[PDB]
Assembly symmetry: T
Homo-oligomer: 63 residues x 12
C-alpha cells in the first residue's frame, strides 16, 4: 500500500529546487519514499524579500 502527503516546497532559485525542498522534508521524516507528483506551482512576491518559487507535490511512500 502507498500513502501520499501533500507538501509545498519553497526555493529562491527554481521550481525544481522547490520540489526538492518538499521531498527532502519527506525523507527526513518518512521511510520508503518512492516518488513525487507535481500538482501545483506558484511564486511568492508580496510577503518575501526575494521572489520565492513554490512547487506543491504529492509525495508517495510505501507503508
Amino acid at each position: 500500500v502507498f500513502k501520499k502527503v501533500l507538501l509545498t516546497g519553497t526555493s529562491e532559485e527554481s521550481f525544481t529546487a522547490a520540489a526538492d525542498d518538499a521531498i527532502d522534508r519527506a525523507e527526513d521524516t518518512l521511510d520508503n519514499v518512492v516518488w513525487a507528483e507535481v500538482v501545483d506551482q506558484g511564486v511568492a512576491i508580496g510577503a518575501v524579500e526575494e521572489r520565492t518559487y513554490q512547487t506543491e507535490v504529492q509525495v508517495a511512500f510505501e507503508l
Copy 2:
C-alpha cells in the same frame, strides 16, 4: 515547507460555518495554520435530523 490536511467541516447553518468547523479542528491539533482552500461543498439530508452543510477544505500549515 507547508503541509495540507484534507478535512470536511459540517454546520447546520451555512457553508461558511462548515469551513470554520474544519479550520477550528485543525487549529485545535496543529500549530502554524496559515490558510485553507475550499475543494468541495455538499449537503447531508437523508441521515441527519436537520439539513447539514458540509465544506471540504485543504488546510495548510507551516512545518
Copy 3:
C-alpha cells in the same frame, strides 16, 4: 440505486440559501432525497432588480 437531478437554486440572500432553494424544490416533487453536491455558484446582476445568488446542485434521491 440513486438518481441525481441537476438543479439551480436562487436567493437574494446567500449561496447557502440558494442551495436550500433547489433542495426544497426537489423535496416538493421527489421522495427519498438523500444528499446534494454543489457543482457551480454564480450571481445574477444585469437582469434582476436585486443581486441574486445562484447555487447549482446535483440532488441525489434513492429509487
Copy 4:
C-alpha cells in the same frame, strides 16, 4: 461582446459577502456589469488578525 475580469473579493463575514466585495469593486469601475461566476474560495488565517473569507469571481460586463 462580453468581457470578464478575474477578481478576488474578501470579507470577515462569509463567502457570499466576499463575492459581493469583488462585484462592488467591478461596479465602481465598469459599466454594464451583468453576471459573476465563482471560480475559487479560500480562507486567509496566518497573515490576518481575523479569519478572512475570499471568493474569486469572473465578473462579466457588456462592451
Copy 5:
C-alpha cells in the same frame, strides 16, 4: 469533522480488490472509517512479476 487519507491499494486480481487493499489498511490503523472515493486506477507491469492492479482512494474517517 471528517478527515481523508490518500492511499493506493494493490492487487494481482482486480481494481475492486485493490480498493479493498487500501481500505483494509485504513481500518487496521484508524477508527471510524466511513467511506472511500476512487481517484485513480492503474496497472504495474515493468517492475512486478505479475501484472498488479492499483486503485487510489481518498479514505474518509470521522474524527
Copy 6:
C-alpha cells in the same frame, strides 16, 4: 437525439457489478438504452453491514 440519466448503481461484489446495477434499472424503465459512461466510483463502509461498491454512470438512451 440521445438523453442521459445520472444513476449510481450499488453492489456488494465489485465496481463492474455496481455499473450493471444502474444499467439494469435504466433498462427496466427506459427504451433504447445504448451506452453508459462511468463518471465516479466509491465505497460505502460506515452505514452498511457489508462494504458496498458504488459506480456512478451517465446512461444514454435514444429518444
Copy 7:
C-alpha cells in the same frame, strides 16, 4: 429554480446544427427553455452512412 437535461443533438452538417437539434427537441417537450451549455462534441463515422456531427448540451429550463 432552473433544471437541466443532458441531451446530445446530431447533424450531418455542423456542430452548430447538432446543438440546434438538441435544443429543438427540448423545446418540443418542455416549457420555458432559457439557455444551453455545450459540454462535449464528437463525430460518428463507423456506424453511419454519412459523417454525423454530435454536440452534447445541458439545456436549462425554468421550473
Copy 8:
C-alpha cells in the same frame, strides 16, 4: 510576453461566427493579436428574439 483577454463573442449564425465576433472586437482595440483559444460555448434562448450562439475565447496578443 503575451497577455490574454477573456471575451465572449455572439452570433445568430454559428459558433465559428461567435468566435470571430470576439476576435474582431479584440483587433479593434489591441495591437498584435496572435491567437485565440476556445474555452466555452453556449446558446442564449430565453432573453433573445433569435437563438444566439456564444463562443468564449482567451484572445492572446503580444506586448
Copy 9:
C-alpha cells in the same frame, strides 16, 4: 481494441471543417476509423494570411 491518434485539423472556414480536415487525414492513412472526440478548438491569427480555425480531435480506429 480501439486506438486513438491525436490530430489537429485546420480550416479557413469553420471549426466543423477543421474537424473534417483531421478526420480526412486519418482516413487517408488508417483503416477502420470509427469516431472522433473534440478535445480543443482555437484560431490562428498572427502567422497566417487568413484567420485559420483549428479543431483538435482524438480519432479512434479499430485494430
Copy 10:
C-alpha cells in the same frame, strides 16, 4: 524516455479484464511495456449482443 499509446480494451466480463485486453495488445506489438493509467471506462449496450465493458488506458513503454 517513455512513450504512451491510448488504447481502449473491451471485455464481456469486467472493467479489469477490459484493461487487460488493451495491455495484452500493447505487449503483442511493443517492447518494454512498463505501466498503464486508466483514463476512462464505459459500457457498450446498443450495438453488441452482450453488454461489453470498456476500459481506456494510456499504456507506457520505454523507448
Copy 11:
C-alpha cells in the same frame, strides 16, 4: 480586492526564467504585485531560432 492578469513569459533558458519574465513585465506596469500561479507551460520550437520555454501565470495584484 485582488485582480489577476493572465500573462505568458518566455525564456531561452528555463521554465522558472519564463515565469520571471512574465512577473517582471507585471511589475513594470502594476503596483502591489503579490503572487503568481502557474497555469500552463510549453516550448516553442518551429518559429524560433532557439528552443523557447514558456510559462503562463495568473499574476495577482492588490487593488
Copy 12:
C-alpha cells in the same frame, strides 16, 4: 494537420532538462516538430540511484 506524440523525458538535473530530453527524442525520429505542451511533471526516487525529474509533453509535429 498537426499530430501529437505523448512522451515523458527524464533528467537528473531539472524539469526543463527533462522536457528537452523528450523533445530531443522526437526530433531524432520526426520531421517538422513545431511545439510541445507540458502535461505532467514528477520525480522518481525509489527505483533510481539519483533523484530523476520527469516532464511529460505532447510534442506536436506538422504532417
